Amino acid sequence: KRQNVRTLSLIVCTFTYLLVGAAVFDALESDHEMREEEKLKAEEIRIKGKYNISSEDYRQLELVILQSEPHRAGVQWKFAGSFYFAITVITTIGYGHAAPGTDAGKAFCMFYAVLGIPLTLVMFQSLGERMNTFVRYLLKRIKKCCDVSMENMVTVGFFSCMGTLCIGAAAFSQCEEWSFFHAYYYCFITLTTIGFGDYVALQTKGALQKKPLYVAFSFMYILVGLTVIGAFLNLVVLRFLT
Amino acid sequence: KRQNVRTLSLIVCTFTYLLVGAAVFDALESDHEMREEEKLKAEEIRIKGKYNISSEDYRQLELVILQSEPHRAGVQWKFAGSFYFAITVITTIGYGHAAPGTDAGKAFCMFYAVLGIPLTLVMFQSLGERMNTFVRYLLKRIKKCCDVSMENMVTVGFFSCMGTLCIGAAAFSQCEEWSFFHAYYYCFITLTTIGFGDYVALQTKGALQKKPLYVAFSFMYILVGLTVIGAFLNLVVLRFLT
Ligand SMILES: CC(C)CCC[C@@H](C)[C@H]1CC[C@H]2[C@@H]3CC=C4C[C@@H](OC(=O)CCC(=O)O)CC[C@]4(C)[C@H]3CC[C@]12C
Ligand SMILES: CC(C)CCC[C@@H](C)[C@H]1CC[C@H]2[C@@H]3CC=C4C[C@@H](OC(=O)CCC(=O)O)CC[C@]4(C)[C@H]3CC[C@]12C
Ligand SMILES: CC(C)CCC[C@@H](C)[C@H]1CC[C@H]2[C@@H]3CC=C4C[C@@H](OC(=O)CCC(=O)O)CC[C@]4(C)[C@H]3CC[C@]12C
Ligand SMILES: CC(C)CCC[C@@H](C)[C@H]1CC[C@H]2[C@@H]3CC=C4C[C@@H](OC(=O)CCC(=O)O)CC[C@]4(C)[C@H]3CC[C@]12C
Ligand SMILES: CC(C)CCC[C@@H](C)[C@H]1CC[C@H]2[C@@H]3CC=C4C[C@@H](OC(=O)CCC(=O)O)CC[C@]4(C)[C@H]3CC[C@]12C
Ligand SMILES: CC(C)CCC[C@@H](C)[C@H]1CC[C@H]2[C@@H]3CC=C4C[C@@H](OC(=O)CCC(=O)O)CC[C@]4(C)[C@H]3CC[C@]12C
Ligand SMILES: [K+]
Ligand SMILES: [K+]
């Protein structure tokens, strides 16, 4: 029947894509990982030989450094830090902040995510629909002053996504002193709800407590990018759902 | 009009929820963060005084330890590691694997996510719909052998979610030697597409290369949990979309 055939066809393509991606990633990163591992030991062996660090005390230093990594960025559990953590939790980003060490805190975070994810999803969907309607109205007005097809809507949405990504990359490069490609990759990771791209904002020189304007701009940009992504998904992906 | 009223009403509730969550998180974690910071310095100050570590060379040790953290789990860019990374990328988890250090690799990952996210979403939606249909058929057969309402479907879905979460928590506690609550929290984080909860599996004693059965079971459990979550979202959340 149609349902079973569709499901079986969908399963196979995903597995094939997974295999292809895994093979390409392995073939592209095996040598780099080997070189990085070789360099890092050599360096750690040299420094341990120079400083005569005992094996037993070496693990304690690693644990202390790993546990103190979030604390380097300042006080992450302030009002701004808590707001950023809540934003990441509700938007299913889940990176940049430090996981709470309290069982009650973990339970509260679980309940918060459960009660907040559908609301955020519905709000994003509604705002994306409103943005799509506004874009359609603007296109109709432009055509009248100078019948809209989908392809035009798809092209407009893609151009808007590219422009937003470029603007965010430029802003983050000017603020975080990052490369243009690295800033673009970080913006893409943030807007795709992945969360981890080996980069994080609002974690340098205590920017969470001394630059409220930067935090507000980052939050507004994140919200705008998420709304644009949701609108694009509604335009191109949601038709194939039901 | 209805559209604008809905759009403006959703935003206010979302902002109020964000403020409440941030306030609660701050009030619950400020003291814990302060105590952890105090303990970690005291320890680092004591160890630096004991070993007489120079300030200039201290940063190099931190950089080496931070860069070598993924490498401590073995060769992460093998076939199993690449498959795990691809699974995390397509499922918008984005945690458990080190980010690639190559610009070409980053571009390939971006293209992979772009071309794979809608396909995975559609496959999950279709499989969740099939699971919902099968559950409805089973409930109808049970009622006949011993007219189904929604509330019954919602209760059945919630019970299935709780059972799957408990089974996953028990399995991870028996395998990863974690606490029951910690395993439950990790399973909830994984199934909610958050990704980071300070707990990561398949990263101990090289389990990615010596326990293929464990990796296969973990992948199957992740897929089953994601399918169940998608089915629940279709049952309760998707009606309010369109
Ligand atoms: C077991 C767990 C997953 C339950 C999760 C609860 C959700 C199913 C609830 C909680 C908050 C609810 C929302 C709270 C507020 C609103 C605004 C409400 O808007 C109006 O009443 C005015 C506009 C209109 O008429 O639609 C529409 C429903 C909605 C999105 C609700 C939809 C259903 C939500 C997401
Ligand atoms: C027609 C449309 C598409 C253009 C959109 C306007 C942007 C080009 C503007 C609007 C908001 C601006 C941002 C508002 C606030 C800031 C913080 C500002 O930070 C500081 O001044 C302190 C840090 C430092 O010293 O650089 C740096 C510029 C930036 C990112 C601005 C960069 C330019 C932005 C993105
Ligand atoms: C038309 C709609 C989209 C308007 C939405 C309003 C936002 C522009 C406002 C409403 C609440 C504001 C936030 C309320 C509280 C704070 C805490 C504030 O932190 C501090 O003042 C202390 C730390 C520091 O100094 O940065 C930083 C800005 C921020 C995140 C604000 C950023 C801008 C927000 C999101
Ligand atoms: C600019 C970016 C966002 C483009 C993203 C591409 C997607 C819009 C495409 C890529 C893969 C496509 C899917 C590839 C395979 C199929 C199986 C296909 O199933 C059948 O042909 C049999 C069942 C039936 O008759 O519907 C239905 C469409 C679907 C889900 C496609 C829907 C549209 C997808 C997600
Ligand atoms: C009726 C339904 C609801 C029950 C579903 C059956 C589960 C209780 C079974 C099915 C698959 C089983 C798993 C299959 C494989 C493994 C790997 C296995 O690992 C090893 O044997 C090596 C590691 C070690 O030494 O413990 C540990 C048990 C576990 C998690 C099993 C635990 C019990 C599971 C989840
Ligand atoms: C009805 C449907 C859901 C069936 C789906 C099939 C899966 C049960 C199979 C198909 C491909 C399999 C994977 C193919 C390749 C590998 C690599 C394999 O790794 C190795 O053999 C080397 C490393 C090690 O020793 O673990 C570990 C299992 C895994 C992930 C397999 C896990 C089980 C998978 C996902
Ligand atoms: K995520
Ligand atoms: K996500």
Listed in sequence order, the DSSP H helices in chain A are 2-51, 55-67, 79-90, 103-145, 150-176, 180-191, 207-210, 212-232
Tokens linked to A114? 């459960």
Q: Do B71 and A126 touch (CB under 8 A)?
A: no
Question: Does the beta carbon of A64 lie under 8 angstroms from any beta carbon of chain B?
Answer: yes
Atom of ligand 6 nearest to the CA of B211: 26
Say whether residue B38 is in contact with chain A using an 8 A CB cutoff: no
Sole residue written with tokens 């499989």: B127
| Separation between Cα atoms, residue B75 and residue B206, nearest integer Å | 8
Residue with tokens 């629909």: A129
Query: Residue B213 corresponds to which tokens in the numbers above?
Result: 């059965």
Contact map slice: B 119-138 vs A, CB within 8 A: 119-123, 125-127, 130, 133
B29 touches chain A (CB under 8 A): yes
Query: Can you list the positions of beta strands (E) in chain B?
Result: none
Cβ proximity of A65 and B59 under 8 Å: no
Could you give the CA distance from residue B165 to residue B186 in angstroms, rounded to a whole number?
10
Question: Is residue A95 marked as binding?
Answer: yes
| Residue whose CA lies nearest to ligand 6 atom number 1 | A11
Kindly compute the dihedral angle of the four CA atoms of residues A174, A175, A177, A180, in this order, to the nearest 10 degrees: -50
Cβ-defined contact of B78 to A26 (cutoff 8 Å): yes
How is residue B198 annotated by DSSP? S
> Distance from CA of residue B222 to its chain's centroid?
10
- What technique determined this structure? cryo-EM
Neighbour tally for B21: CB within 10 Å:
24
**What's the full length of chain A, in residues?**
242
Would the CB of A17 count as within 6 Å of ligand 4?
Answer: no
CB neighbours of A82 closer than 8 A, spacing ≥ 6?
B21, B22, B23, B25, B26, B29
Print burial letters for B138-148: b (CB count within 10 Å at least 16), e (below 16): eeeeeeeeeee
Asked if B90 is an interface residue toward chain A (Cβ–Cβ < 8 A), one would say yes
Atom 27, ligand 6: residue with shortest CA distance: B212
At residue A5, the 3 state secondary structure works out as helix
Report the C-alpha gap between A116 and A100 in whole angstroms. Answer: 18
Cα–ligand 3 centroid distance for B7 (angstroms): 20
Among candidates B163, B195, B167, which has minimal Cα distance to B180?
A: B167
